[PDB]
Amino acid sequence: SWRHLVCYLCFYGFMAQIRPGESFITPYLLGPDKQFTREQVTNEITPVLSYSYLAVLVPVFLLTDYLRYTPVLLLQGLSFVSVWLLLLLGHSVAHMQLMELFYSVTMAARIAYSSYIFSLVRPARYQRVAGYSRAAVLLGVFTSSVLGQLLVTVGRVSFSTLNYISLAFLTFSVVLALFLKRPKSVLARMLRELGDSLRRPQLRLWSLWWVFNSAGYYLVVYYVHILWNEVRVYNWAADAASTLLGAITSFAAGFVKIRWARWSKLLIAGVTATQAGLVFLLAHTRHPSSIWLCYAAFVLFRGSYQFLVPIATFQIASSLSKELCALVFGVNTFFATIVKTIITFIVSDVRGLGLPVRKQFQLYSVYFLILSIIYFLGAMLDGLRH
Numbered sequence: 001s002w003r004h005l006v007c008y009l010c011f012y013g014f015m016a017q018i019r020p021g022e023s024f025i026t027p028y029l030l031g032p033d034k035q036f037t038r039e040q041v042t043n044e045i046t047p048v049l050s051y052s053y054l055a056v057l058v059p060v061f062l063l064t065d066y067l068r069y070t071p072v073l074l075l076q077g078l079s080f081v082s083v084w085l086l087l088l089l090g091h092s093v094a095h096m097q098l099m100e101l102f103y104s105v106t107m108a109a110r111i112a113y114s115s116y117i118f119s120l121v122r123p124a125r126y127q128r129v130a131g132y133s134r135a136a137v138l139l140g141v142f143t144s145s146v147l148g149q150l151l152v153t154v155g156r157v158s159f160s161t162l163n164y165i166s167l168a169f170l171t172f173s174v175v176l177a178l179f180l181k182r183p184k185s186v187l188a189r190m191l192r193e194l195g196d197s198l199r200r201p202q203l204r205l206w207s208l209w210w211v212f213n214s215a216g217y218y219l220v221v222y223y224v225h226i227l228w229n230e231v232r233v234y235n236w237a238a239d240a241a242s243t244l245l246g247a248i249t250s251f252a253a254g255f256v257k258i259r260w261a262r263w264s265k266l267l268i269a270g271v272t273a274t275q276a277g278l279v280f281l282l283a284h285t286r287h288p289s290s291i292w293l294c295y296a297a298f299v300l301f302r303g304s305y306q307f308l309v310p311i312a313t314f315q316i317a318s319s320l321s322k323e324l325c326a327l328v329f330g331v332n333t334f335f336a337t338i339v340k341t342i343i344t345f346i347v348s349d350v351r352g353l354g355l356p357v358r359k360q361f362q363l364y365s366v367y368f369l370i371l372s373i374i375y376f377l378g379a380m381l382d383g384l385r386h
């Protein structure tokens with residue numbers, strides 16, 4: 001385990017996210033292999049995934065820490081394999097509903113890897129291993145996107161062949177996850193430990209940052225895709241560049257050392273203000289010069305969030321007394337997706353404050369603005385008390 005414990009963990013994190021046929025699921029559904037109407041792929045496939053992400057997250061984060069994270073990784077891998085198998089068969093609508101349910105299972109179990117890395121190493125190099133793991137995962141996502149687009153656009157393969165390749169890669173990822181090691185009123189004690197951990201000043205700040213900034217980033221990304229498709233070839237290039245910059249920034253965050261608990265609220269406020277500025281710049285671009293300045297901006301935005309994705313996790317592991325690193329990650333992810341759903345309902349739904357995409361992004365930038373003057377006014381409040 002001297003050389004094949006963190007290196008192997010990063011390698012598995014890289015290989016588990018290689019699904020070259022991931023981003024091409026919708027065209028495959030709408031393609032000639034499966035005769036699906038535009039209306040169904042969007043009204044019977046996306047809502048089920050959206051709801052099941054909320055539904056299946058709770059059991060996953062409740063049981064991942066007791067299961068010691070190897071069974072949850074195996075479940076995520078087998079669920080990815082079942083997703084692609086169901087994609088290959090795809091007999092009817094219910095098959096694809098089950099596929100989306102399993103995909104939501106995978107997205108819910110994504111937290112098990114981020115807890116496994118911390119439960120696998122001594123509580124001294126949490127930050128370095130967090131940076132390594134996030135760099136590996138984001139590099140895997142970037143490689144998956146680039147491989148899919150290279151095979152489809154500059155290569156010559158069908159969607160079925162791409163899905164076969166993705167299924168083979170997912171089988172290999174399951175094989176890799178098999179060899180991973182397993183670290184060596186229960187609910188009442190669980191919640192008591194969660195509350196006592198939340199009483200700490202370092203877990204609480206980064207948990208709030210997760211719940212809010214992660215929700216903001218997810219909203220911004222999920223609607224940046226739609227905004228770019230609204231106002232084609234370079235879209236995947238921008239996505240891959242953003243993911244690669246995210247991997248680089250996660251590596252840098254793993255390798256950065258600053259005196260935390262003092263320059264931590266200030267760092268969060270600065271990063272959130274930078275992200276707010278980037279989103280404001282992204283929204284305020286209607287001139288023809290909207291293929292260089294905005295794309296890159298979004299890239300930076302993604303990287304910015306990733307620059308705080310391995311630190312926050314690390315700052316949750318360094319401030320946890322029990323083996324509840326998975327519980328806090330799961331609760332934070334669940335609350336972040338709850339906040340994202342609430343924001344979507346309040347800004348995107350017609351019944352609520354229904355606004356178009358432009359004003360939607362004007363709201364998201366302002367949402368980050370309220371999220372960058374709260375942490376700004378949190379680094380001087382505690383400074384005053386000193």
Ligand SMILES: CN(Cc1cnc2nc(N)nc(N)c2n1)c1ccc(C(=O)N[C@@H](CCC(=O)O)C(=O)O)cc1
Nearest residue numbers: 017022023025026029045049100103110137138141221
């Ligand atoms: C939503 N989606 C891909 C996706 C695309 N089209 C689809 N189309 C259909 N019909 N169904 C789907 N389930 C579907 N899924 C996703 C979701 C999350 C990440 C993801 O992994 N996101 C993190 C990366 C970190 C990680 O790997 O967990 C991020 O920074 O955005 C990638 C693609």
